[PDB]
């Protein structure tokens, strides 16, 4: 069964950036519902169960550019009383919009905390070692939710 629209696809992957093996593991996604990054999805289109291949994914087809306006300074007092506010620490910001958006703490300087709203990989080119583990049809529930069942 070939990877295509509405197929639930399971992959084993290895993520590299400039030679650094950042992440490894296994996931399943619903194909053709914008759940996986475009580049890696385009590379998976038509593939059979068992196939192994490599994929280079530019930022454009990964997590996009790195907007410098995404880098803002916020007061240290705005953080939870008993939370470690250090570089790499992840939190959430929320306002009247009612939309929680995630951030990574970049630097802490006195009462000024520099945070980054960009995706951690925004601006990077990703290299992938991919193995197509399994390809099955999606259930009605899955199609209804537009996501694979974890």
């Amino acid at each position: 069964m070939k990877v295509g629209q509405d197929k639930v696809v399971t992959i084993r992957y290895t993520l590299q950036v400039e030679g650094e093996v950042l992440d490894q593991g296994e996931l399943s996604y619903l194909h053709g519902h914008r759940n996986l990054i475009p580049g890696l999805e385009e590379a998976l289109e038509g593939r059979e169960e068992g196939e192994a291949f490599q994929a280079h994914v530019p930022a454009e087809k990964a997590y996009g550019p790195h907007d410098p306006e995404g880098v803002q300074v916020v007061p240290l007092s705005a953080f939870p009383e008993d939370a470690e506010v250090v570089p790499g620490a992840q939190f959430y910001a929320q306002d009247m919009e009612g939309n929680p958006m995630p951030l990574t703490v970049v630097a802490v300087e006195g009462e000024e905390v520099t945070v980054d709203f960009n995706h951690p990989l925004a601006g990077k080119d990703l290299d992938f070692q991919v193995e197509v583990v399994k390809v099955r049809e999606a259930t009605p529930e899955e199609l209804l939710h537009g996501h694979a069942h974890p």
């Binding site: 907007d67 306006e69 995404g70 803002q72 705005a78 929320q94 306002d95 009247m96």
Partner: peptide, 15 residues
């Protein structure tokens, strides 16, 4: 994308 906007009342939680 995206910025912070004090023209509301932005807060931060650590879940």
């Amino acid at each position: 994308t995206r910025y912070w906007n004090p023209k509301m009342k932005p807060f931060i939680f650590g879940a």
